[PDB]
Paper text:
Taking inspiration from Ubiquitin- and ISG15-processing USP-substrate complexes, we semisynthetically obtained SUMO activity-based probes that contain a reactive warhead at the protein’s C-terminus. SUMO2 and [name] feature identical Ubl folds and differ only in their unstructured N-terminal extensions. We prepared a [name]–2Br probe with a 2-bromoethyl warhead as well as a ΔN-SUMO2/3-PA probe equipped with a propargylamine warhead. Both probes reacted covalently with [name] as evident from a shift in molecular weight and led to pronounced protein stabilization as assessed by protein melting temperature analysis, indicative of the specific recognition of SUMO by [name]. We solved crystal structures of [name] in covalent complex with ΔN-SUMO2/3-PA to 2.4 Å resolution, as well as of [name] in complex with [name]–2Br to 2.17 Å resolution in a different crystal form. The latter structure featured two almost identical copies in the asymmetric unit and was used for single-wavelength anomalous dispersion measurements with a selenomethionine-containing [name]–2Br probe. Alignment of the catalytic triad Cys236, His456, and Asp472 in the [name]–2Br probe-bound structure was observed, and the importance of the respective residues for enzymatic activity as well as probe reactivity was confirmed by mutation. Alignment of three independently obtained relative arrangements of the [name] and SUMO folds revealed near-identical positioning of SUMO in these highly conserved areas including the SUMO C-terminus, the Pro66 loop, as well as the Gly27 loop in the fingers. Strikingly, mutation of Gly27 into serine abolished [name] activity completely, in line with Gly27’s central structural role in anchoring of the SUMO fold into the [name] fingers.
Ub/Ubl protein conjugation can be reversed by specialized isopeptidases termed deubiquitinases (DUBs) or Ubl proteases, which antagonize Ub/Ubl-mediated post-translational modifications. Moreover, we focused on recently structurally characterized [name], which is the only deSUMOylase with a USP fold but for which its mechanism for SUMO paralogue specificity had remained unclear. [name] featured an approximately 25-fold higher activity for SUMO2 over SUMO1, which suggests a much more pronounced paralogue specificity as previously assumed from fluorogenic reagents. We structurally and biochemically explain this substrate selection, as [name] uses the USP fingers subdomain to contact the Gly27/Gly26 loop of SUMO2/3 to discriminate against SUMO1.
Numbering used by the authors:
A (entry chain A): 225 to 256, 262 to 279, 301 to 501
B (entry chain B): 16 to 91
The structure:
């Protein structure tokens, strides 16, 4: 049973990211060196090997990370915030770490009312989906959207993957259509991608991280639940509360 | 008088012309009025950072044809 941060100064939007990072195998392999991510994983493991002593070791690196985010994120300690904004700003602090998350794709659009169509290539570490089609899948990553040319609604815009990084993350404003995570596994150009962690958005004001452990069980990292975590036999968050989904390439 | 694009996560894009030193509050409020959104319910982002109504394009070093990201407010 792994250790986790305790809630303080409304930092759940940051704790949820920190739990996801320390349980990423690809990240742990890359970091293992005066990196803030090396300091994060070293302090976490130093705390995980051992309650107040654990909290102090975890709070120091959390404070250091928060202060690094503060100029970009423009927040004051105790402010509420979103991991959608915070997660990529954290990654951009070190290009060698950010490269693990940067995937290339293209937004493909074609209006059925008028002829308007485009296909725009982008490169992001975290893309947002809203009003996804019921059949939404990483290999069929489509959502309903308006047309900028004729204002027709319920047209479809589709993400066409072009180059997927070792870590692949997506944000869903209204969650996923369903919560059986095995159906969202996918291969892309020969490599398997499985959901290894999920950030849950509970009550529209609180974030909790879920971690897939080796035995197929799950670990809930709710910072309200103290330093320890909670083991669940299987995944449990309601589909509409699935906020950030983290795919990781399987080696 | 730079041109800015306000891109929502649904794929919508609204073009705006704005002077470099006028605060973005007029842009934000007009975008909300056009899309039927509430200022309290959305967030604006440029180059990864949230932007206030007191911010100006010159303060954020915006260029012509730059893009502002609009998000449904989802904090915690
Ligand atoms: Ca893992
Ligand atoms: Cl794992
Ligand atoms: Zn159209």
């Amino acid at each position: 049973l792994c250790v986790q941060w305790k809630n303080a100064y409304a930092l759940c939007w940051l704790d949820c990211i920190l739990s996801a990072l320390v349980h990423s195998e690809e990240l742990k392999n890359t970091v293992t060196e005066e990196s803030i991510f090396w300091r994060l994983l070293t302090k976490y493991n130093q705390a995980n090997t051992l309650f107040a002593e654990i909290e102090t070791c975890l709070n120091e690196v959390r404070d250091e990370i928060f202060i690094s985010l503060q100029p970009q994120l423009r927040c004051t300690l105790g402010d509420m915030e979103s991991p959608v904004f915070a997660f990529p700003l954290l990654l951009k602090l070190e290009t060698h770490i950010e490269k693990l998350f940067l995937y290339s794709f293209s937004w493909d659009f074609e209006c059925s009312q008028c002829g308007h169509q485009y296909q725009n290539r982008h490169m992001k570490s975290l893309v947002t989906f809203t009003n996804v089609i019921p059949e939404w899948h990483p290999l069929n990553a489509a959502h309903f959207g308006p047309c900028n040319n004729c204002n027709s609604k319920s047209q479809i815009r589709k993400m066409v993957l072009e180059k997927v990084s070792p870590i692949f993350m997506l944000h869903f404003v209204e969650g996923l259509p369903q919560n059986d995570l095995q159906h969202y596994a996918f291969h892309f150009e020969g490599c398997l991608y499985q959901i290894t962690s999920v950030i849950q958005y509970r009550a529209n004001n609180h974030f909790i991280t879920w971690i897939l452990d080796a035995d197929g069980s799950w670990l809930e990292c709710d910072d309200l639940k103290g330093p320890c975590s909670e083991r669940h036999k299987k995944f449990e968050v309601p589909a509409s509360e699935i906020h950030i989904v983290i795919w990781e390439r399987k080696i | 008088h730079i041109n800015l694009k306000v891109a929502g996560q649904d794929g919508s894009v609204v073009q705006f012309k704005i002077k470099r030193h006028t605060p973005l509050s007029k842009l934000m409020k007009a975008y909300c009025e056009r899309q039927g959104l509430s200022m309290r319910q959305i967030r604006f982002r440029f180059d990864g950072q949230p932007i206030n109504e007191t911010d100006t394009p010159a303060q954020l070093e915006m260029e012509d044809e730059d893009t502002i990201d609009v998000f449904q407010q989802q904090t915690g």
